[PDB]
Amino acid sequence: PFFPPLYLGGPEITTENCEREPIHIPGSIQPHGALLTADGHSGEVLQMSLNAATFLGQEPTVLRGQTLAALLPEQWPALQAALPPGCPDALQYRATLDWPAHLSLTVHRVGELLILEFEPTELRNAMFALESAPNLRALAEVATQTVRELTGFDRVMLYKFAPDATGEVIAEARREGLHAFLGHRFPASDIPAQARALYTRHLLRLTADTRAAAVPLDPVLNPQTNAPTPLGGAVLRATSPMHMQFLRNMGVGSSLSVSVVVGGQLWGLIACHHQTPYVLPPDLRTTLEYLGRLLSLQVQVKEAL
Numbered sequence: 001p002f003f004p005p006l007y008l009g010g011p012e013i014t015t016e017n018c019e020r021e022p023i024h025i026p027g028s029i030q031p032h033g034a035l036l037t038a039d040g041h042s043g044e045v046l047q048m049s050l051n052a053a054t055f056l057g058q059e060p061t062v063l064r065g066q067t068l069a070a071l072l073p074e075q076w077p078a079l080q081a082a083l084p085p086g087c088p089d090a091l092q093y094r095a096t097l098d099w100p101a102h103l104s105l106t107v108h109r110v111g112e113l114l115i116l117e118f119e120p121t122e123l124r125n126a127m128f129a130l131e132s133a134p135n136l137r138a139l140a141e142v143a144t145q146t147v148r149e150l151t152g153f154d155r156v157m158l159y160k161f162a163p164d165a166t167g168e169v170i171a172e173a174r175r176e177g178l179h180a181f182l183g184h185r186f187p188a189s190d191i192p193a194q195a196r197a198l199y200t201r202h203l204l205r206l207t208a209d210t211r212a213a214a215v216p217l218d219p220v221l222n223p224q225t226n227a228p229t230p231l232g233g234a235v236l237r238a239t240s241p242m243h244m245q246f247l248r249n250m251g252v253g254s255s256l257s258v259s260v261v262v263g264g265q266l267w268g269l270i271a272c273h274h275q276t277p278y279v280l281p282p283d284l285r286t287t288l289e290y291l292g293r294l295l296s297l298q299v300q301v302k303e304a305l
């Protein structure tokens with residue numbers, strides 16, 4: 001089973017117990033956005049990232065207890081209608097907020113809790129190219145090139161899982177001067193079993209700055225349940241420190257991947273690196289999620305034949 005998280009007396013993770021880290025409930029976020037949680041009926045703000053004033057203009061203890069009807073009067077009715085009790089936790093409400101300076105708002109529901117993420121914000125020929133690839137290798141090449149053109153990332157790989165969960169870079173698009181990873185293979189423990197399971201359900205994750213300290217969510221436990229807040233559906237969730245260290249030792253300042261899912265199993269990842277910290281813009285992320293779904297469908301075809 002999972003260890004308790006660090007704020008419930010759990011141990012710091014080592015290579016002996018990688019698979020036991022409760023990565024879905026870190027009780028903290030990355031500093032390039034802000035996160036609030038709120039009661040799904042009242043809209044009462046229950047939890048606040050400690051950096052909330054940087055993005056929302058009010059300190060955590062001032063936001064606490066206010067309602068989304070007061071804080072987001074133009075969005076609250078639409079948000080309620082969009083995310084009723086019992087909807088899937090990957091269903092999202094999205095809005096673009098005007099702010100004295102836009103802010104992207106992304107909301108999902110887990111049980112009776114709304115999870116609100118705030119971050120700053122500012123193809124057809126490509127899809128046909130993916131469709132037109134005549135074999136799996138060519139498809140992988142086209143996908144990595146297309147994603148690199150979209151995003152500007154220094155490296156874009158297609159990382160394929162073997163049946164023993166080892167991984168291999170099977171295609172890559174890379175900036176001039178970088179080392180090749182093409183053909184290199186990696187142990188199963190580099191993406192441990194609980195991560196692979198999370199990535200079958202929540203199809204995009206990232207680390208915008210591999211040296212940035214996490215920002216606590218407080219109070220850390222959901223007051224509704226006196227239990228940890230599930231953050232697997234939040235892109236702002238803090239990343240495992242073991243993985244952050246892996247990336248720093250690779251010379252990677254920013255990382256992002258999108259799951260490739262075939263017959264309901266995790267086939268691989270579109271895995272991206274940048275040498276310098278880098279926030280992929282929100283609109284570019286949404287496009288990249290869509291390409292992941294389209295790639296997945298294409299891989300299922302090409303691999304059968």
Ligand SMILES: *C/C=C1/C(=C/c2[nH]c(/C=C3[NH+]=C(/C=C4\NC(=O)C(C=C)=C4C)C(C)=C\3CCC(=O)O)c(CCC(=O)O)c2C)NC(=O)[C@H]1C
Nearest residue numbers: 014015018186190191195239240242243246255256257271
């Ligand atoms: C004892 C635990 C270890 C461990 C844990 C860990 N790793 C991940 C997530 C990722 N690991 C990745 C690995 C690679 N990226 C590459 O570029 C290459 C090779 C060229 C490898 C082998 C990847 C792609 C991920 C996914 C996330 C990402 O795209 O940045 C997690 C989960 C992270 C999270 O979502 O919070 C964990 C717990 N990794 C180890 O190496 C050992 C130390």
